[PDB]
């Protein structure tokens, strides 16, 4: 829905959110190429509670496996990390103090 240079950065913001399911699928011994691809197919249909099932070794329901994460954990992980990376591209000059 955006245009200009803003549309190329939200896609870079959205592609960086797929790293944590790629991290969870790679550490579980699953194939991370087909796991994150299947996760985008389940959430496009309407499955908002779909994720990586480390017990079955695939994609299943999360609330059936009783995996509950608080909202303040995930909101502050997105708010503090975005505020940090908004400063590193602004703070860039190496000055070695004597």
């Amino acid at each position: 829905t955006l245009s200009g240079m803003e549309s190329y950065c939200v896609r870079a913001f959205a592609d960086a959110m797929e790293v944590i399911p790629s991290t969870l699928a790679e550490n579980a011994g699953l194939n991370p190429i087909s796991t994150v691809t299947e996760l985008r197919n389940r959430h496009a249909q309407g499955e908002k509670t779909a994720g990586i099932n480390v017990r079955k070794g695939g994609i299943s329901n999360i609330l059936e496996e009783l995996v509950v994460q608080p909202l303040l954990v995930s909101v502050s992980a997105l708010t503090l990390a975005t505020e940090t990376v908004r400063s590193i591209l602004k703070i860039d000059d190496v000055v070695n103090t004597r």
Partner: protein, 523 residues
């Protein structure tokens, strides 16, 4: 002096490498902080070699130059110049460093033109006098009609915070900076605004507290919240007094008399606390430490006891509650007590702080800065300190000028108009003074990525025929009116950028010999 050198380990140079090392060392200082000038300039990260390096990111030009430690002798004049600019007005330390370096860069262009350096000093003294009249005649005063003065104060804080890390927080941090100085209602002491930095949360979660925050929580068995209390603070010793008689011992004959003395010592410590509660108070703040024997007396009477806040902590509590220090308790009718509504304890970042909610005569504030890292909190504290110091002097001097390159083109126009009414000996030095004043909107325009060769040319064509309020619009990248956009700076800030850079460039240009002595413990 190089030929047949009569020095041990010292070296010197006269008129060949003296002005060469002075112009190299001063331009490289100005070219260092050149990228930090303007609302779109980047920031620096300062690091050491090791041994508790303590990295401190700063965008202000004074904090960069005070930590680098330049070995050049002439570069230390520009470092000390930006130190006075931070201590006097608190802003323009980056603008006074680039302007003093662009004067010596134009003076390096007068090396090959065989201009005498005393002619450039006499040419710049007449150029600085013409530039003082440009800022004085264009200053906008504000007396009555206070609804336009509070709107003018938000343009000062909006211009200062635009060149810092608080870029997309001007809807919040402008209100945190204007209302902090507006709650002072007097002199700009610049210490009643206690800034507390706590990790966790974004910069939008920061706020200005309506009361006051403190540490060193309330006792052991004392109440944590008292509604409608009378706050009495103190600066006296509670226990282990050893009262002011050096060379006094307890020389008794038996150990039964020692038990009578130590009971008499605790009775006088109990009688001192009994003189405090005759005022009818509910809270007690001592600058010194409170030991266990008077702490039990305040807990039995239902009185709070805040022990060892700070040396300057009782000063802010005296300005936010409306009381006095009251280090001696012998006249309850001559001691004025504070006033509050809630002394409940709040938790900010898993740390319990004493919140003095609902205080009367609150001429003190508490800014609760919350950031993602410690590097952001150290930058936002210096960014707020560069904004509160200008508003503390804008309420003392209400004269404001139009910033954003508009003030520099007004100063450069008055020099160029008087450069044509002078003979050719000093007219070339005055034209180099006007070209360095036009470099300050050129650094701002080129830091965003705009066409700096055309925007300053459009500013020079605008100011040549009218348009006294025309400046640089960094939002869209064009030329707009500064009175409409609301980009103004203080008169005393812009005067100290012009005056201190003209005096510092006068010193370095008059140097023809740099005789450095032999240093100690350097082999």
């Amino acid at each position: 002096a190089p030929v047949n050198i009569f020095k041990a380990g010292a070296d010197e140079e006269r008129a060949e490498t003296a002005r060469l090392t002075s112009f190299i060392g001063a331009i490289a200082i100005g070219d260092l902080v050149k990228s930090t000038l303007g609302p779109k300039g980047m920031d620096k990260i300062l690091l050491s070699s090791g041994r508790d390096a303590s990295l401190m990111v700063t965008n202000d030009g004074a904090t960069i130059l005070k930590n680098i430690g330049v070995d050049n002798p002439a570069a230390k004049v520009l470092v000390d110049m930006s130190r006075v600019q931070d201590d006097e007005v608190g802003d323009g330390t980056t603008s006074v460093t680039v302007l003093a370096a662009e004067l010596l860069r134009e003076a390096e262009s007068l090396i090959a033109k065989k201009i005498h350096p005393q002619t450039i000093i006499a040419g710049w003294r007449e150029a600085t006098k013409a530039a003082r009249e440009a800022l004085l005649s264009s200053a906008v005063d504000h007396g009555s009609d206070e609804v336009k003065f509070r709107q003018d104060l938000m343009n000062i804080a909006g211009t200062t915070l635009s060149s810092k890390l608080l870029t997309h927080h001007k809807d919040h941090f402008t209100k945190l900076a204007v209302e902090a100085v507006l709650r002072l209602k007097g002199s700009g002491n610049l210490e009643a605004i206690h800034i507390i930095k706590k990790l966790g949360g974004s910069l939008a979660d920061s706020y200005l507290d309506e009361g006051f925050l403190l540490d060193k929580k309330i006792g052991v068995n004392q109440p944590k919240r008292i509604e409608n209390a009378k706050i009495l603070i103190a600066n006296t010793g509670m226990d282990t007094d050893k009262i002011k008689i050096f060379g006094s011992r307890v020389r008794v004959d038996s150990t039964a008399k020692v038990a009578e003395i130590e009971h008499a010592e605790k009775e006088k410590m109990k009688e001192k606390v009994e003189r405090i509660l005759k005022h009818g108070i509910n809270c007690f703040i001592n600058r010194q430490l409170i030991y266990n024997y008077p702490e039990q007396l305040f807990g039995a009477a239902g009185v709070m006891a805040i022990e060892h806040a700070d040396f300057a902590g009782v000063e802010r509590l005296a300005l936010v509650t409306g009381g006095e220090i009251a280090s001696t308790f012998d006249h309850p009718e001559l001691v004025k007590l504070g006033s509050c509504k809630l002394i409940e304890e709040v938790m900010i970042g898993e740390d319990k702080l004493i919140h003095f909610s609902g205080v009367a005569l609150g001429e003190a504030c508490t800014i609760v800065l919350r950031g993602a890292t410690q590097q952001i909190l150290d930058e936002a504290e210096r960014s707020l300190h560069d904004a509160l110091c200008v508003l503390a002097q804008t309420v003392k001097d209400s004269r404001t000028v139009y910033g954003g390159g508009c003030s520099e083109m007004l100063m450069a126009h008055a020099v160029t108009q008087l450069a044509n009414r002078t003979p050719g000996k000093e007219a070339v030095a005055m034209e180099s003074y006007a070209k360095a004043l036009r470099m300050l909107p050129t650094i701002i325009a080129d830091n965003a990525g705009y066409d700096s060769a055309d925007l300053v040319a459009q500013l020079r064509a605008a100011h040549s025929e009218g348009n006294t309020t025309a400046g640089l619009d960094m939002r869209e990248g064009t030329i707009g009116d500064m009175a409409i956009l609301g980009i103004t700076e203080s008169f005393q800030v812009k005067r100290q950028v012009l005056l201190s850079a003209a005096e510092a460039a006068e010193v370095i240009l008059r140097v023809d010999n740099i005789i450095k002595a032999a240093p100690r413990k350097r082999v």
